[PDB]
Amino acid sequence: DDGGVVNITYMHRLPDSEGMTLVNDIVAKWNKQHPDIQVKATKFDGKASDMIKKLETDVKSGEAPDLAQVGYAELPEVFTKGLLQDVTQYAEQYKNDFASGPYSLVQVGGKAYGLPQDTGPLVYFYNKAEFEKLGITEIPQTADEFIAAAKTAAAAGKYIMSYQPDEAGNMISGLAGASGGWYKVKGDSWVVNTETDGSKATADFYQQLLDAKAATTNPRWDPSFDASIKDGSLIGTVAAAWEAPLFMTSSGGTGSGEWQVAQLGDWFGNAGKTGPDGGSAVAVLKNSKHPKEAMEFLDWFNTQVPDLVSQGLVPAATTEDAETPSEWSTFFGGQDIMKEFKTANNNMGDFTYMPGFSAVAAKMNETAAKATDGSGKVADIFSDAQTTSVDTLKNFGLSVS
Ligand SMILES: CC(=O)N[C@@H]1[C@@H](O[C@@H]2O[C@H](CO)[C@H](O)[C@H](O)[C@H]2O)[C@H](O)[C@@H](CO)O[C@H]1O
Ligand SMILES: [Zn+2]
Ligand SMILES: [Zn+2]
């Protein structure tokens, strides 16, 4: 048996903003109950996409945590990098606490490497009051009707879409991928096609919007993006479900009581589906001496549903229903937005990510930014992702067909 006190470390990249139940306050409740398994939780300091680069560094270094947030999209990459610990015999014990889709996303080759934490379906945030003022009385459901509506808004200095070039790798892959995967293993080789009917429909949608100066072009994480909400010019956008509290904070309160959540319209060749943008597991890393207790604490942490929901998470936990925080329904015109998130989750397409997808995402972000001044075409995002996808797999020494 272990010594009397086991010490577990947990690196996460949850927001911990004002009004949320802090990860350290969640963890402190566990620590008080479990003198036998003490947990130290720290928040990664840097850009989200860089966290797994730091994990890679610290695994090699022997400074790595026992547990670390790893996106579903990142898990095949960090697996291939040798950063994870097979914890199948532990995960099996907690499987029934989690929805089965997300659980399957902590697996590589029928071995499990952690537990799922949340999901990222894409939805549509809009200010219904401001849509009314422009005579937009229904969310238009075809790309053509939407683009027409967006041109009307733009003429009044309003925008019912954002183009977020710093997020193309996560959001635009999600949108295109709603209608079909880009990556599949066929026997001995990967088959890559990032230029699906979805990818084409997606490009055409944002291309028309950009050409019409009918979508904002501020990078999502820049002060200018927040400025566009505060000032009231951005009145609609695609967002990942986990953006709800971030968006609310970014608004400074502007439009409070008028905002609404809808399902994505049929704007991206998506045919009634949505797609994933982010969503994460927590993985047990290669050199953790205490996989059992790490997973025991994790199962408890990932089932603290209201606390997780305060972080904007749409939990993978099925142990109790997630509920809309009173602050959020107030902001969102009295709406039970959590119902919309679950509807979106249940209509979300599966999407396999190749190992090395981080390079695909980073390229997509680069090619996306070129379209803002019209020197690149939006379509280029996907032709480039094709070539970067193929080259990254070959660089990993993997076979591409
Ligand atoms: C795919 C990705 O990493 N997107 C980043 C966001 O990460 C999500 O963060 C929420 C918490 O706010 C959940 O943990 C979710 O599962 C993650 O996918 C991150 O919030 C933002 C801002 O730092 O960057 C995105 O790139
Ligand atoms: Zn205990
Ligand atoms: Zn142990």
Automatic annotation (TrEMBL):
Record-linked SUPFAM superfamilies: Periplasmic binding protein-like II
Binding site for Zn(2+) 2: H34, D36
PROSITE patterns: PROKAR_LIPOPROTEIN (PS51257)
GO function terms (MF aspect): metal ion binding
Protein's name in the database: ABC transporter substrate-binding protein
Binding sites annotated in the UniProt record for Zn(2+) 1: D2, H290, E293
Annotated Pfam families: SBP_bac_1
Keyword check for Cell membrane: yes
Organism for this UniProt entry: Bifidobacterium longum
Domain of life assignment: Bacteria
Record: residues binding Zn(2+) 3: D321, E323
Record key words, sorted: Cell membrane, Lipoprotein, Membrane, Metal-binding, Palmitate, Signal, Sugar transport, Transport, Zinc
Keyword Zinc in record: yes
